[PDB]
Structures are given as C-alpha cells and as structure tokens.
Amino acid sequence: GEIDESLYSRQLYVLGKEAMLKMQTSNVLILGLKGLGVEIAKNVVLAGVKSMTVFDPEPVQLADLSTQFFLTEKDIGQKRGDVTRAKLAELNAYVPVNVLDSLDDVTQLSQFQVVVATDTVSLEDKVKINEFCHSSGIRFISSETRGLFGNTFVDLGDEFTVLDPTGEEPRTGMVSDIEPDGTVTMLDDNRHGLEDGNFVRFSEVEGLDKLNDGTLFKVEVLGPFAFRIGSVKEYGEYKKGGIFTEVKVPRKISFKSLKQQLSNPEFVFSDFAKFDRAAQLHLGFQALHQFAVRHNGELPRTMNDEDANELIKLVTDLSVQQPEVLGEGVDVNEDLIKELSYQARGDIPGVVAFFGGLVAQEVLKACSGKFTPLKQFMYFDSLESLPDPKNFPRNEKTTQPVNSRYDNQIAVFGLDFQKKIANSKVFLVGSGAIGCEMLKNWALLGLGSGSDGYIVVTDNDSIEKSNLNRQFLFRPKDVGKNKSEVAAEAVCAMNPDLKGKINAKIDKVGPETEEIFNDSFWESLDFVTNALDNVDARTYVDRRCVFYRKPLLESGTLGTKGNTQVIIPRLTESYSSSRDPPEKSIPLCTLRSFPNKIDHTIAWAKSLFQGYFTDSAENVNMYLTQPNFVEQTLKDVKGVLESISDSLSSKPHNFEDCIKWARLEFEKKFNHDIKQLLFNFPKDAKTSNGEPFWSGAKRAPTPLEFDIYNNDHFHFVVAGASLRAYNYGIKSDDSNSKPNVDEYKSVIDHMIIPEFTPNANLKIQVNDDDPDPEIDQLVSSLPDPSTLAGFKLEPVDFEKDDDTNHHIEFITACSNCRAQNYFIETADRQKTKFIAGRIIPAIATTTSLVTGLVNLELYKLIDNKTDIEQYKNGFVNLALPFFGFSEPIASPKGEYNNKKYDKIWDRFDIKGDIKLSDLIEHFEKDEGLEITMLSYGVSLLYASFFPPKKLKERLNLPITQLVKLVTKKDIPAHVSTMILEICADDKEGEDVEVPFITIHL
C-alpha cells in the first residue's frame, strides 16, 4: 500500500507522491527529547517517515514539562526517551518508534538517513556527530532554543540534490509564435510567468516537430509576454499551435560541516529588520557553549549580572580573534548578548513550536530532496515579547524557580507575568489544525489556569480521518467525535492544571448563534484567537472584536505557506481592513465552449453534476409543493422549466432505465453537443489574417465514441446511473457491489443511440462581451401537481470526502470525457477532488510554526502593549525557506468638526432606547451633527429627505419600535445592544464620515 490517501490526503498535495515515496524509506534519529525534540518528533512522525528513533537517557525533571507536552508529573525520574516513545508511537501506526540506549557504536548510527541534534546535545558533541555524519553521507540538522532566542543549523553533506526548489505548479502557456532566433511570443495577453534560467519543454508546435521531443530549453526572459530559447532554425519553421511547460531540473548543492560553518557561516535571516543580529547571535551561541565548558556543563544563571559580563567577554574575545565575523569595526552588541545570558535557561513554548515546525520540515526536505534546504545557519529572537520592565520587573528574585512546570517560563518573564497569563479569559474559535496546536501551547503556557482565567473553544465539526495527519490531539479511535471536546480532554491530560478550566462548546460562530455568544459572553473575554479555515467566519469574528474592543490573534496556512496577524483595539487595522486576492474568474465562454485546462473541465463537470442531481430535484419539489412557483419564476427561466418536464416525463422505473439515461447523456454531452459546436464553427474557419478560428485558447474538439472499456466512459455511466437512481429512490444494482461491467454492457449493447441532427438556427457565443447570452408549450405541458401528489425527488448534497457516494466518481469521469473531447490530459480522482472540493493543502509542520509565532505575539497582548512597533505580523514559506515580519498597519484616522477619531474602533455610545427626535438633538447639542441618514443593518430608519407624513410618525419613536415598523416583522428578544449607522452633515453643512452608534438597551 504505497501512500494511504485517506490519511495523507492534505499532506499529499503539499509534498508529491514521489517525495513521500522517498520519505517512506528514511530512518530518522532525534537526539534529546525535551520540548524542542518532541516537537520535531511529533511533526516528523505525523508526516510518515520509514522509522523514528529517539535518544534521551536523561531523567525526567519537573522543569522539562515547560514545553514537553508528552511528559507528566508521574514520569519524573524515568528516562525521557522511554516515556515519550510510547506517546510518539501512538501518532502514526505506519511509523515504528524506537529508543536508542547509548551512542557508542557505529553500526546503528550509520543506518540513519537524518540525524537531528537538539538543545540537550553540547556544541562539542554536535561538532563530533556532524563530522561523522558529513563523512558518512548522513544528513545532519541541529537546533537549540534558549529563552526568546533560537537557531537551526543544516548540513546535508557534500552532495545533495534538490528535485524541486519551490513546490509550485510548473508554469504553462500557449504559444503564439516562435521565431528562427528562438523568441517565443505568448498568445495575446497571457503571461508566461517564467524566470531567467527556468527550463521549458514544448508540445503541439506544428512546424518545428523535434522541438516537441521532451527536450528542454533554457529560458531568457524578454518581457512578461515573451522569452527566448536560442536559435530553432535547425528544427524547421514555426507554423502554428504550441504549449510550453516548465520542467524542474535536478540541482546538486554542497554543504559545509558544522566545524567549517562555525568560523565561516552562511546565513538565512529570520527577520530582515534584524539582519545585523545574526552574526551577533552566531558568536553569542558559541560563547554560551564556551561558558558551559568552563562551568561544568552549566548555562549562565537566570538574570545573573556576573554571568552576563562573562558572556560579553567571551563574545568580545571571539570578535578580537575573528574581526571578520561581526565585521571590521563592528562592535559587540552588549545589550543583546546580555539578554542571551539572562534568558539562557528559558524554555518558551512559542519559540520551541517555531523551531520544531521548521526543523521538522528541514528533516522532510533532507529525506526527499523536495523544496530548498535552509543553507546552513539561521538565528531567531523575539525580544519584543518581553513585558515592560516597569510593570513586570525582571530580576533574580522575580524570575527564580518556585518548583513548578512553569519555572523555565518564569525564568524569562517573572512570576507575576506568568500568573497574569494564567488569569486570562480567552476564546478559541475553531479546533482543527491550528486549534490543536493552539490549545497545546496554551496547556504549556498554563493559560486560563488560576481562579480568574479560563478557555472557551468552539467548533461544530466532528473529527475526520483525513485530519489526523495534522491534528495531533486526535486518535483514529476518535473519528466521529466532536473536535473541541476531544481536544479539551486531550489537553488536560497534558496539563491537569486546566481541569474544569476549559469550556468546550460545539456551536458555529455567526448570525445564528448570537444568543449563546451574547454581550455578557464577549465583554468577559480578554482576547480572542482565530483557528479557522475560511474567510466568512474570520470576518464575522473580526466584526465582533471591533464591536467589543477585544484583541484578535489571526493566523492561516496553505501548504508550506503561513501568515500571522494581530488586531489591537484603538491601534491597528482589523482583518477586514484588508482584502486578499480573489479567486481567478473563469470566462463563461471558456467554460461553456472553449476549455483548455483541466480546471475548466472540472468546473464544467461540477456545475453539470449540480444541474443533474441537485437543482433538478429541488426545482421539481418546489414546483410540486408550492402554489405559485411558476409565476414567481417568470418575475434562469427556460432551463428552469425544462428541468421540471424532463425530470417529470423521463422518470426511470428501474436501474436499467438509469443506465440508459446516463448512456444517452453521454452521447448528448460528448458527441452531439461537440458536433453542434463544430457545425456552428467548422474546423477550418479562419478569422482575420488567415488565422484559424480554432487556434490559441480554442482547441478544436473531436466527438467521443462510447467505449465501455474506457475508464472515463465507463465511470460516467456508472456514477451517472447511481446518482439518478438516488434522485428517484431506486435500488441500484451497484448499491450492494462493484459495478458489473457485463451488466452495463448488455444494457448499452441493446440501446438505439439516436444520431446527431444539427441545429441550423442555434448560435453559440464566442466572448462574454458578445450579444446575445415555445414558452407556454413548456408551461401547460407540465402535468398538474395533482397527478404527482406524494412524490418527491431526492436531491444530492455534494460530499467530497465520501469515496463511496459516486460524487467525485462522477465529476472525475465527466471532466475527463470533456477533457478527452478537447485534448486535455485527463486527471485522476484525487486531483479532481482537490479542485472541485476546493481542498486546502495542509501539513503539521507549517501549523506548529504558525501557532508558535501567534503565541509570541500573545505575550505582547498580556502586557497591553501600546507601541505599534512592538507587534509583528508574520509571513512564512517553509519551502524556500522564508520568514518575514511587518509591523501592523495603524487604524485609519478621520476628522469631523476638528475632532479626531478612529475610523475602525470609535463609536458614539447612547444609554437607554432613546427616541429618534432625541437622537437627532443629542447630535446637534453635543457633536455638531445633523443626521442625513439612519440605518440598522440593511434597513433604512430615518432620512432628512423623508416627507412630513413619515417624519412625525417616526420622530417620536424609541429605536426599538422604530425597528419594529421598518422591518415587516421584527422584535429583538435577547439583544441588549444595537448598532446604528449614520450619515451626517457637519457644523459647516458638508457631509462627513462619522463613527457608528451603539444603543445600550
């Protein structure tokens, strides 16, 4: 069983099949199982390598639990490796998990493909292990974490080959011309999107035949719509046609050993605002190892002044000896190095998560050759996470161990700060990938523990099989249970301090749940955290947070890509202040008549499916039940009615009839309709110049000849029959079994397939910009609802992840038949499932990292940070790898009557259910505003242009009653707050933008 698709589904769209075949054969060894080691291990086991081996004979101590989510108070005194092994072993049945007992041997060691050295391994020992790996051809990765600082180092050996540097779909495009000197012009307007030094192959270039060989050509970019490939004079002369496809080519790269890299490092920066720090921390991290050697393996003590001075001397000595490393003339950054000393014993969940997600991905890179490895060193810090010293003073007393799983967090932040985290009241909206990682971080934070705090998590989803791969709080046995409930349970198992402290709810968060999530609910909270996977719901929450003035932590992922965003009341723009690029719109005519990509034929197959088995049934049942359905339709007209007469006089009586139907539909859509198109626009028609009509995006199609042995012809009929059976409530002959080929064959073999008669008057449009896009006959040939009383059609509810329901079967077959029509490569059902079901690629790796960065932003909220420059919006692509940060954007400021206001966060507050006349007067005697317009949602309540009839009927009414009147039926019921929007003229008579209104009932 090469790659279980029901488990590795989403991950399979991120990594290839080929790369996972390569992972499936790698053995990984992780050295040290404290917080960092167990993160890496979790992410790697979930991804599914050949085997995971683990080394940590050190005894479990209390303080380890700071970030080690797989240890408990009971495990203390036992070997970290032994105790984690079993827990890791539960994550992925496909990956065996072993403990290694000693490291003195070679025969074991040389069997591993990747070795990861963790914070528990000293720099001396790191240099030795890397040396053995390098010279052995074993990939080596190391990483350490120390308070708000971290680094990773990658050595993949003298020879490594990257198979695909980016993981991006290869570029593709239509050729308009190839000139003798190898200049390829794109088809009018199409961008190639290529880059100098990309490689490209060619198809369908009529005239230069051997050019379509599969031979690749180096690309020299001329502009957005043209590129050169060198002379093609020797292949012939271009005539017509042509498709380029980018091809990724193997790149051999060479890595240096740790020993080499220590004195001549190569960096990848974690934060470009902080580039001058890499060289500094590179020296810093070497210094705290020189410190340990000098102080019998001990790190500098917490917030200790003497030890910091020593560390500054060590770094200084490094730079005197190598002036090149900081740079000639460059001074030692003493306040940075001081901080490294101060925090060296710190163990921060946010930092560990970040390095775990990212180191884990490097491991996967090292197994597969997929994506671009980190070229050697990266340093990180999140010093902006430190609280303001004046409110949470950090010193030796404040910061000392108090015998608690949290004291390596206290090591950095102080007791009082750590206590304030415990006392937070938070809302987590969603319990999927980010949810699980988040709750996990929170457990380690102790967030919501302690009498004044708590956690609310909601998610209406139950646990699905395809989710286990990145939602690591769930087990195969939990599928079908509710996400939030299982996650709260699982997290209290990690940290019992959260028992009776997490309220796990199972409700959606939108218009329909405002009773349960009322003002009292929201007002109570300190901040809100998004763990969602769609935009509508992100927008709903963003609206609530601005109304209630609560901080919002946002984050999202797509494959190796991830982002993080902070919304701070009266400070930043909110989520909605910004819009992402829309889904690229496909021209109606391209879908309808001129597909040239598999995306085009899927979309078409998907709407066809919805036509056949959803909208047909709905329309019929609406027709049958409702009194005035027909007239309402009149007031999207012809097709509606046709759906209701075909669907009512074409009723199947058995499954046989459904086979016939589907087989006839096959002839309609892939033979007759194609022949009509070719009748409409003959194969040889020529537009301006002498250019064929069928050129560029218009591929001349060829009608299908039904062939049962063809996988797409066969499955279109099978899926088609079964779904029609389902509409009409007929026992399928496949319902029990595998589709019986000889059955379908015998039926189809006995059918009259009526031949094609072209329509000489029906015109198909070519462009969307073109005009133009028998009635009563269709009407009173509808056989009266009375003839069909008690009869219903059963509508299909598209369910993409149920492989037995024929949905994806249908879309795949239907798309591929149309793809056959127009000479497009057919797609498998997993690729169709991805596109039709709009599935988002996800991996645990990017999810940990992103959750980590969120939690480093969390500390800033706890300190009620006022300075915008302290906050970091995060952007990430682990494929490259790339990390970048931007300070959030300030909330837009407005002005009215020389009075400044925040356009997002400012509002007029009004006590009681005020009369409309009082409202207007209050705004004149207090704010210099006359009301042009007053509205509650989409309803207009008041406007200065209203007649004196409507004026005096409404002027006297309280807002409650005013809303009862305008809304044909409205009475609030449980609402204590009302938002009103306003248009006003200022003190000078001109129109002004103005804060909204809140009426407190």
Binding site: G432, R538, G556, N563, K872, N877
Partner: protein, 76 residues
C-alpha cells in the same frame, strides 16, 4: 537604481527605481511585470509594510535592497 522584489512563491523581480519614487509607483511597476493589481500587493521591507501614500526613501530603501511580496492564507 536596482531593487529586488521576492514573492512568497520564490520568484525574484528586478525593478528600475529612483529613491524618490512612490509606493503607488513601485506597485504599478509590479503590475506591469507581474499582473497583480496594486490593490492586492502587500510589500514589506525591514520590518515595515510599505503604505501607498509614502515614498521609497521614507522606508530607507537603497540600491540592491530586497522587498517581499506577501499574502494572507485562509485555512487552519
């Protein structure tokens, strides 16, 4: 002078710029080179997001400086 714009997809765009050039300006050069409307372009440099109203020199952009074109991602 030359600046470099790197996309999240790992594509590098060279641009021909003046120190005085607006952010509005740089963005339409992206639109020319890449097709992305300025509306959807999010540029970051040295820890700051580049806002329309301002110019290059404001954010201390130099020759050979690297900008990054970024994105919010739905799903989690």
């Amino acid at each position: 002078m030359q600046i470099f714009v790197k996309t999240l997809t790992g594509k590098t765009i060279t641009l021909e710029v003046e120190s005085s050039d607006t952010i509005d300006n740089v963005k339409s050069k992206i639109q020319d080179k890449e097709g992305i409307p300025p509306d959807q372009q999010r540029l970051i440099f040295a820890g700051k997001q580049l806002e329309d109203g301002r110019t290059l020199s404001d954010y201390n952009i130099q020759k050979e400086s690297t900008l990054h074109l970024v994105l919010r991602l739905r799903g989690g």
